[PDB]
Amino acid sequence: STIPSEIINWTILNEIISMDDFSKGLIIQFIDQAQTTFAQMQRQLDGEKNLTELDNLGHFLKGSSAALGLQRIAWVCERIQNLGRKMEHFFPNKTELVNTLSDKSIINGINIDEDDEEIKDENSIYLILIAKALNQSRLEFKLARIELSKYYNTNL
Template sequence: MAPTETTKAGGYSKSAPPKLSDVKELIDEGTFEQILEMDDDDDRDFSKGIVYGFFDQAHNTFDKMEAALKDKKLEELSQLGHFLKGSSATLGLTNVKDACEKIQHYGAGKDESGSTDEPDEKVSLKKIDTTLKEVKVEYTKVEKFLRRYYGEEVKEEEPKKEQPKKEEPKKEESKKEESRAEEKVKKAEPTKK
C-alpha cells in the first residue's frame, strides 16, 4: 500500500498507510481486494486508474442527478442511480451502492426496496433529494480514504455552512418596479413632434 496517514484523533498523520479494515462500514474489503489483485506490482497503477476514473464518473453523475432532480425527471434519476450503483458495487463501496439503489427505485416510482409503488412523484422527488445529499456525504468519506490509500495528501475541510437563500421578490413588487423603470425610460425619451 502507498504510504499516507495514520489515525490520529480522527485524522491521519504521514507515517503508515490506511487499512481497508479501518473503513469496513464504507468499503467491502473482499470486493475491493479483487480490484487490487489486478495490479501488477506494488505501485497499484491499475487499480488507482480504476478508482480515480470512478471519482470522475461519480462527480459527473452527481451533477447530472442534481440537474435531473431540478427538472423533476424521475426516469433519468432512476437510470443515473442504476448506473452509479453498478460502478460503486464493482469497487465494493457499500453505502454509495445502497443509496444509489434507493435513488434508482424512487425514480422508478417505488419505495426504497423497489417492492411497493409510490404514486406521488413529489414524495419520490423529496426522497431522492434527501438520499442524494446522504450519498454525497458517504461518497466524500470514501473518496478521501481512497485518495489517502493511494498516497495522496488529503486536506480535512471544515463542514460548509449553508448560505441563507436570498428571498425572491414577490411578483407584484417586481411588476411595480418594471412599470416604474418603463415610466422613467419614457420620460427620458425625447418627444416626437
C-alpha cells in the same frame, strides 16, 4: 437490506488491487464518473424532474460503485432507483445513516452537510426524497474518498 456498515468491502476491492497504477487509475475514473452522475441527478431534480432518468442514473452509478466495493454508495443508489420507481416513500436522515458506520471517527472534523444541495403532484414526494438521498450519496462519496486516500497515501 439496510445500508452496509463498512465504507469499503475490502473483499471486493482486493480483487481489483491484486491486478496492480491500475487500481488508482480505476478509482480516479470512478471519482469523475460519480461527480458527473451526481451533477446529472441534480440537474434532473431542478429541471426536468424525470423519475425515470433518476432511476437510470442510479442504475449506472450502482454498477460502478458496487464493483469497486464502495457498497454504501451502491446502497444509496439502489434507494434512489426505488424511490424513482415509486416503490419506496421514506429515506432516512443523515444522522441515522452515519450512525451505522463501522468507524464513526471518519466523521470527526468535517461538516457532514458540507456538500448539501436543495431543490424546489404525486411526484413531489419522491423527488424530495431523491434529493435527500443525493445529499446522502455526496457524503458517502466524500467518506469513500477519505478512506481510499488514506489507503493509497494520496489525495483522490
